[PDB]
Structure formats: C-alpha cells, structure tokens
Amino acid sequence: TPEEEARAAVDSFPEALRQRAWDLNVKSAEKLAKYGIEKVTELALKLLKEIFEKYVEGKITREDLPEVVKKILVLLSLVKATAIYSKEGLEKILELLKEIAKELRERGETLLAEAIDYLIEALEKLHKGDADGYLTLLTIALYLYFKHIVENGARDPELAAAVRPLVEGGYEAVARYYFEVFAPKLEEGTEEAVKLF
C-alpha cells in the first residue's frame, strides 16, 4: 500500500533525524500557541482561502513564486499549531481543505487534490501525536505535489526539472528532501507568522 511503502521509506532514515523534525514541529507550535489558538486558527483560515482563490484564478505567475511559497510556509505553520493544540480549530481547517480538494478534483487537478487528501491525513496523525504516521503521510502529500508539478510542467519547465529527480526517486527521495531541506525551513514560516501578530 502507498502508506506502507512510504512508511517503510520513513523508517529507513535515522531516528535522530526524525526526532529532530518532530521536535522542530512542536517548538514551532508552542511559539505560535503563545499568540492564542483561536487567533492562530482564524489567521490560518483566512490565508488558506486567499491562496486557494488566487490559485484557481490563475493569478499565480512564475514571477509570483517566491511570495506564494512564503505564504504557504506561514499557512502550514499556523495549521500545524492548530493540529497540535485544538481539535475544534483543526476540524474547521480540515473541513475547508476537504472542500478545496473536492473543488480541485472537479477542476481536474487530481494529483494536487490527492496531495491535499494526504496532508489532511497527516494533520490528523499530528493531532494524535503520531510522529512517524505524520511523516509518512506528509511524504506522500509532498510526493503527489511534486508529481502534480511534473505533470503540469508546461507551466514552469525549470521548476518541473528541479523536482523531477525527487519524483523519479520515489518516497525515499521525497523523505530525504523533507528531512534535509524542508523541515529546517519551518522556522522561516514560523518567523513570518510571528510578524503577522
């Protein structure tokens, strides 16, 4: 099963590295939880809606890419804080993501919709405190996201070319990218979120 294979990929990496990623998520969540979980959730919902509305309208150009990544990093930091500390807030964020995934599927962005389904599942594992289950589902969500970029690479061929080795390398390559590149960037998202308050 995709979940079993991705999980196997996650377990092949050193425990210390996985523990670092987990500890980093929790520290970011505590930093954001200091600002009120209701406020964190409200901001998360606002940013999620903005990003989705802009995306569907095709107003994200290649020139726009650095700013959107920053907005996503903030959104993920806020959402993760909510997943750790508020079931009700989490339920609202998840409900919205399910609607977005359905809409994207109806629009034919099927891989992106699948990526979002797996993000939703990862957030539920995060809420339950399952670090390995979280990293497994997050790896699948990133893999599907990159696959979406490669299948749509006509929109940014260079970006497709950059992430293609990750797709060709499978869940192991995606997990490797996460541990070595993505997880350290979480702090960047947290800092931008702090600035918003």
Numbering used by the authors: 2 to 198
Pull text from the paper.
Here we present rotamer inverted fragment finder–diffusion (Riff-Diff), a hybrid machine learning and atomistic modelling strategy for scaffolding catalytic arrays in de novo proteins. We highlight the general applicability of Riff-Diff by designing enzymes for two mechanistically distinct chemical transformations, the retro-aldol reaction and the Morita–Baylis–Hillman reaction. We show that in both cases, it is possible to generate catalysts that exhibit activities rivalling those optimized by in vitro evolution, along with exquisite stereoselectivity. High-resolution structures of six of the designs revealed near-atomic active site design precision.
We obtained crystal structures of the four designs: RAD13 (kcat = 3.8 × 10−5 s−1), RAD17 (kcat not determined), RAD32 (kcat = 1.1 × 10−2 s−1), and RAD36 (kcat = 6.2 × 10−5 s−1). The crystal structures agree with the design models, having backbone Cα RMSD values between 0.68 Å and 1.2 Å. The catalytic residues of RAD13 and RAD17 adopted the correct conformation with heavy-atom sidechain RMSD values of 0.42 Å and 1.09 Å to the design model and 0.89 Å and 1.2 Å to the catalytic geometry, respectively. Despite the near-atomic precision with which the tetrad was reproduced, RAD13 and RAD17 were more than 105-fold slower than RA95.5-8F. This indicates that precise positioning of catalytic sidechains is by itself not sufficient to design efficient biocatalysts, even when scaffolding catalytic arrays that are derived from highly active enzymes.
